Amino acid sequence: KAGLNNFNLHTPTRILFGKGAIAGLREQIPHDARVLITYGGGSVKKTGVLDQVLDALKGMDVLEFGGIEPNPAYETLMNAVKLVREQKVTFLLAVGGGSVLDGTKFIAAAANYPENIDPWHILQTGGKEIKSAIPMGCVLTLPATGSESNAGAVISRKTTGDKQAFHSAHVQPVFAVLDPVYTYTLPPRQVANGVVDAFVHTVEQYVTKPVDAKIHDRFAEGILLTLIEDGPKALKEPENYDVRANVMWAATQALNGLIGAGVPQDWATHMLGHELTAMHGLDHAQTLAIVLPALWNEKRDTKRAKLLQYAERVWNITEGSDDERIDAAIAATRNFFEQLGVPTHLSDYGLDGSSIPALLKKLEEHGMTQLGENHDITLDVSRRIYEAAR
Amino acid sequence: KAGLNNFNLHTPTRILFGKGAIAGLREQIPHDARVLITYGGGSVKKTGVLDQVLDALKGMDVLEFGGIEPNPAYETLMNAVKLVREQKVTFLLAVGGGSVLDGTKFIAAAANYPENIDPWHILQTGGKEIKSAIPMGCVLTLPATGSESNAGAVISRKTTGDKQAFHSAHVQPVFAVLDPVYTYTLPPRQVANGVVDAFVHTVEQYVTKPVDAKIHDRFAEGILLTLIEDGPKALKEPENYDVRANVMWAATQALNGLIGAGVPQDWATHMLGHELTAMHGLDHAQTLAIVLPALWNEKRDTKRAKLLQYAERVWNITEGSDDERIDAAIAATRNFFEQLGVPTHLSDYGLDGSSIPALLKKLEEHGMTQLGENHDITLDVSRRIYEAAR
Ligand SMILES: NC(=O)C1=CN([C@@H]2O[C@H](COP(=O)(O)OP(=O)(O)OC[C@H]3O[C@@H](n4cnc5c(N)ncnc54)[C@H](OP(=O)(O)O)[C@@H]3O)[C@@H](O)[C@H]2O)[C@@H](O)[C@@H](O)C1
Ligand SMILES: NC(=O)C1=CN([C@@H]2O[C@H](COP(=O)(O)OP(=O)(O)OC[C@H]3O[C@@H](n4cnc5c(N)ncnc54)[C@H](OP(=O)(O)O)[C@@H]3O)[C@@H](O)[C@H]2O)[C@@H](O)[C@@H](O)C1
Ligand SMILES: [Zn+2]
């Protein structure tokens, strides 16, 4: 096994966790700040969560911007960038799921970006030239992405069919309110999506090259084990507080930097999946459920050791040849996704694979030609993975 | 099974981890600052670490203060506090173990304390009235306490036989340099002490009362499993980087706030142990190895469920009655400490238990009369625990 690489870990986001944790929200925002509350397509109005937020900040200088959609659009967000500049917003409060949080991270950085440069430049450069951003916090209504306490975001330009990520410490939220009760109203589709996303985030940082990082491994395995136990329960028992709190906390811990610090990371499943969302409109987690089992089969030898550890530690699979244990672990993973209600073949979404050449052209356009922890997933390999996922 | 309590988790310490991670040190400290490098009895001069730190901060306005011995003494630290006030120090850099870091946390707070109040008041109030402190960073040479990325400190006043803790967010280090290579020089005694302290920190937050916090449980179990595997290897292979890296990271993750957030915590072993260090001079971890097995036997009824989970998850103990399993778990724990070279009976250290009445007087003086997660360890229970530890 290889060793940990040197790392620099900073996890500054203050977490306010639990039932009624919104009581601590007002405290976190500077009293003289001009706050823009961002939110999504309207679920927060129906549930009363937006009203709770507005009441927490009663008397403060508050504006609202609604309409940030799943796979948040540059086209949507430029409206808020204009508003933020013209109204001199000095603090952003994101209320919703990962799309709302990510859209708000983009607004935060875009507002301070050089005036004469199209802020889509952030996505073309992965956020490396971001020098500052408007501070933000969040109230998370959907556990999936860990965006509440990480420095990443995924923004789409819908006109041209691009879905790309950026990263910058400047868009790391100052705080996050995590109240499991706010997740009770999630449609099961989204509950399942969130369990899958947290699961896949974990394996992107854990089912990789073997490194003797025992805490990282145990923590990753712990998240996976918890999602397998309580994920399905969150569908059967939607208002079980303990179950929903376990899922919410698992999703946070899957991508705040801790389990990936100094260890090789894959992300190929994510990169391949992004193109499926961009071209075909599939939910982010749906694309991962399709790509992951096909990718793991294709990459079963570079990933042999960690697939075998995963098989044993997460699924209690120990018997047979390495090939048999890996087949069984992949099958168990596919079944887990399917049983959550997340199908794992392109044909389940009415896609026959004729779009694969077009997806590869988009991968190439986006510089996704040497994917994976070994930088060995070329366009011919990506073609084979997509083909296997039909 | 009970539920998670609401919590407020903030872990702001930047971690610079790995071989030669001191190359990131200079960047962290403000150029304009007047830095006081604090250190211990002299090992840092002998090894070469203090020179690496001075080399890293070459040209900057630095001062030095050595002499902070294990169980950092109020008398010594007040000499540092006077130096900090006279020289207008604006930043502290602790280079050493937990005693050095903790002593520096006290210097940081006591220096800003009201001039006409004895800053030992900090320990009388547990740090509750601390309004500010001089910012600090650290370079850790001994993994044990997790003090590098927590807001706690334990100071001794040798004059009056006191060893007491304070807590304040103001003494949380801005950064911590964690280079496993610096731990290679640790005497076996201190390697063992660190493994034990990390182990006990974890069980203080985990072997309590059953709460359905699955991530907390898996993470705590993960630290414990890792310390059992690689702790003995750190003695046998002192220069094995991967092994030393696993132990160092485990100790960090054992007390940064993560695994204890919203869950019941015990700390009774620590409170009873502090009085053994103050009275008899035992290393902190030696006092924990003595007290823990005795306390668990005494509290086997209230701790039943988590002792059984501990037994299964950490020691693979599944067969037999509940009492047989608990006995085997306690026995396994005791053996583990002993095989690290840390005896678990007072008589192993030449203490016959005649000091127990005097220990109870000190516990009473310090308000340690209703200890444990159920606040039910009274002085007569503490007597019973000490007596069983003979
Ligand atoms: N920042 C990051 O590090 C990452 C972000 N990712 C990105 O995150 C986005 C997905 O975020 P999610 O949190 O999964 O979901 P969305 O925010 O899109 O929301 C999905 C739907 O759920 C609904 N919803 C959210 N909270 C609800 C509530 N409690 N009650 C009822 N409905 C609720 C939303 O409905 P509304 O828009 O009406 O609010 C939305 O349709 C995708 O765009 C994905 O690419 C991922 O790529 C991830 O891998 C990495
Ligand atoms: N801040 C906190 O959260 C807590 C701190 N605790 C407190 O922490 C203190 C113990 O700290 P540790 O890190 O275990 O050890 P110390 O700092 O006292 O040092 C012990 C000896 O180790 C030696 N040492 C440290 N780094 C070395 C190196 N790498 N090479 C060779 N020798 C080295 C030290 O020798 P020197 O003084 O010459 O430097 C010391 O004698 C005790 O006073 C304890 O009460 C604990 O109570 C803990 O439970 C919680
Ligand atoms: Zn301790």
UniProtKB/Swiss-Prot annotation, chains A, B:
Biotech applications: Is able to produce valuable biorenewable fuels and chemicals from a broad range of starting materials.
Top EC class for this record: oxidoreductase
InterPro entries assigned: ADH_Fe/GldA (IPR001670), ADH_Fe_C (IPR056798), ADH_Fe_CS (IPR018211), BDH-like (IPR044731)
Inducing stimuli: Expression is activated by the HTH-type transcriptional regulator YqhC. Induced in response to conditions that favor lipid peroxidation, such as exposure to H(2)O(2), K(2)TeO(3), paraquat, tert-butylhydroperoxide (t-BOOH) and low temperatures.
An annotated Gene Ontology molecular function: butanol dehydrogenase (NAD+) activity
GO biological process: response to reactive oxygen species
Keywords: Metal-binding, NADP, Oxidoreductase, Zinc
A GO-annotated cellular component: cytosol
Highest taxon listed in the record's lineage: Bacteria
Cofactor(s) needed by this chain: Zn(2+)
CDD domains in alphabetical order: BDH (cd08187)
Chain residues that bind NADP(+): G41, S43, N71, G98, S99, D102, T141, N150, G152, K163, Y182, T185
EC number per UniProt: 1.1.1.2
Disruption phenotype: The deletion mutant shows increased sensitivity to reactive oxygen-generating compounds such as paraquat, potassium tellurite, chromate and hydrogen peroxide. The mutant shows increased level of lipid peroxidation products. Deletion of the gene leads to accumulation of isobutyraldehyde and a strong decrease in isobutanol production, suggesting that YqhD contributes significantly to the isobutyraldehyde reductase activity in E.coli. The mutant shows greater sensitivity to glyoxal but no difference in methylglyoxal sensitivity.
PANTHER family xrefs: ALCOHOL DEHYDROGENASE YQHD
NCBIfam families: PRK15138.1
Sequence similarity: Belongs to the iron-containing alcohol dehydrogenase family.
Function summary: Exhibits NADPH-dependent reductase activity for a broad range of short-chain aldehydes. Shows highest catalytic efficiency toward butanal, propanal and the highly toxic aldehydes acrolein and malondialdehyde (MDA), which are produced mainly during lipid peroxidation. Mediates resistance to reactive oxygen species (ROS) elicitors, such as paraquat and potassium tellurite, probably by protecting the cell against the toxic effects of reactive aldehydes derived from membrane lipid peroxidation. In contrast, Sulzenbacher et al. detected significant activities only in the presence of alcohol and NADP(+). They reported in vitro NADP(+)-dependent alcohol dehydrogenase (ADH) activity towards various alcohols, with a preference for alcohols longer than C(3), but the affinity for the substrates is poor, suggesting that these compounds are not the physiological substrates. Perez et al. did not detect dehydrogenase activity with short and medium chain alcohols such as methanol, ethanol, propanol, butanol or isopropanol.
Record's comment describing the protein's domains: Molecular dynamics simulations of the YqhD homodimer show that the oxidation state of the NADP/NADPH cofactor has a profound effect on enzyme structure and dynamics, which is consistent with differences in enzyme efficacy toward alcohols versus aldehydes. The NADP-bound YqhD fluctuates between open and closed conformations, while it was observed that NADPH-bound YqhD had slower opening/closing dynamics of the cofactor-binding cleft.
Subunit structure: Homodimer. The crystals contain two dimers in the asymmetric unit.
The protein's name in its UniProt record: NADPH-dependent aldehyde reductase YqhD
